[PDB]
Structure 1
Amino acid sequence: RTTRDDLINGNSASCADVIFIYARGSTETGNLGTLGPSIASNLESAFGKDGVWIQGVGGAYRATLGDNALPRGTSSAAIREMLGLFQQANTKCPDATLIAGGYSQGAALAAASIEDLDSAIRDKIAGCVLFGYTKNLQNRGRIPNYPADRTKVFCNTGDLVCTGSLIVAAPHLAYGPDARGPAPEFLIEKVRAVRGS
């Protein structure tokens, strides 16, 4: 449901082919929040339950609303937590293809983490989806040090956080349809582009 720790719980001897790491929005529950479960169900349909590990960013990432105002759009502790998960994935399953995503503060977190990541691990992330990307204007719709072709940003018209503000308006809470269709579609396509099928 809203909590998935497939990577942490998973057996190193039976690694999934695809590992998805996702960061939730502010004040959201579990480690997947409102959008993560919809993406997860679709990835499982495409790769099979044993074919993909779903891992939310929990631990030190508290998804505190106030942290949106910090320099990177999230806390240093949260960035350290997500970096640790990518590092755990790389060590536990070196042959797995990675994919990632985040919503709101989680999108800023995914961007900051990917920016700081060792290039060798970052290069294994086949695609990343960002919803209501809080640093969209500041970063010009990109994740620093990560290719544009592997990035997909979902920013609704009227969602003030995509336009340099930190005000939460109704469009910021309307990413449900994207999480159910285009977001997983993009992730599946990017994984197949490199793994084949």
Structure 2
Amino acid sequence: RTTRDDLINGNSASCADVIFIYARGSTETGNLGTLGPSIASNLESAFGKDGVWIQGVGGAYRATLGDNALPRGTSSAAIREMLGLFQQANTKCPDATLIAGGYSQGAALAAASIEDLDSAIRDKIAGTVLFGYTKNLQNRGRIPNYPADRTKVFCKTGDLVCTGSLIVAAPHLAYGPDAEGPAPEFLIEKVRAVRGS
């Protein structure tokens, strides 16, 4: 449901082929946030539970509001944990396709980690959906240093983080819809695009 540690407790003898690494937004609980369980499920329906690893960024990532104002979306300790979860996924299951997603500060974070990832590992993230990208303006809509055709930024109009400020407004929470539709679709579509039938 809201806490998911598939990678962390994952045993490589039994690696999943697809591995999702999600960064929840500010204030939420567990490591999955409000939108994560939705994606996880849509991903699982398409892959069977056995076929995909759902792992949320916990540890040093606190979802602390003030951090939304740190120089690059969040804190160093966050970028770090996410980066380490990428390495860990890569090292634990090398031949596995990776998907990463993020909402709010979670997405501020996901761009930060992917932007300074080892390119080779970064090479294997087939798709990344961001929700209410608090850095949507500053990074000109892309995740700096990721293939643009792999980035799906769900920035609903009316949401002010997408436009250049910390002003949280109503539309910033109108994301449940997309998290059960275009978001996991985009991912399953990108992963099947780099796998089979």
- The structural deviation recorded for 1:56 is 0.2
Aligned length: 197
What's the secondary structure of 1:63's corresponding residue?
coil
Describe the superposition over 1:143-188 as per-residue Cα deviations: whole angstroms up to 9, x where unpaired. Answer: 1110111110000111000000100000001100000111000000
TM-score normalised by L of structure 2: 0.99
What's the secondary structure of 1:79's corresponding residue?
helix
Q: How many Å separate the matches in 2 of 1:60 and 1:87? A: 16
Describe the superposition over 1:26-84 as per-residue Cα deviations: whole angstroms up to 9, x where unpaired. Answer: 00010001000000010000001000000000000001011010111100000000000
Describe the superposition over 1:98-134 as per-residue Cα deviations: whole angstroms up to 9, x where unpaired. Answer: 0000000000100000001000100000000000001
What 5-or-longer segments of structure 2 have no aligned partner? Answer: none
Aligned to 2:150: 150
Q: How many Å separate the matches in 2 of 1:196 and 1:153? A: 26
RMSD: 0.5
Residues 1:123 and 2:120 are matched in the alignment: no
What's the secondary structure of 1:59's corresponding residue?
coil
Runs of 4+ residues deviating >3 angstroms: none
Q: How many Å separate the matches in 1 of 2:66 and 2:156? A: 22
TM-score normalised by L of structure 1: 0.99
What's the secondary structure of 1:37's corresponding residue?
helix
What's the secondary structure of 1:100's corresponding residue?
strand
Identity of aligned residues (%): 98
- The structural deviation recorded for 1:11 is 1.0
What 5-or-longer segments of structure 1 have no aligned partner? Answer: none
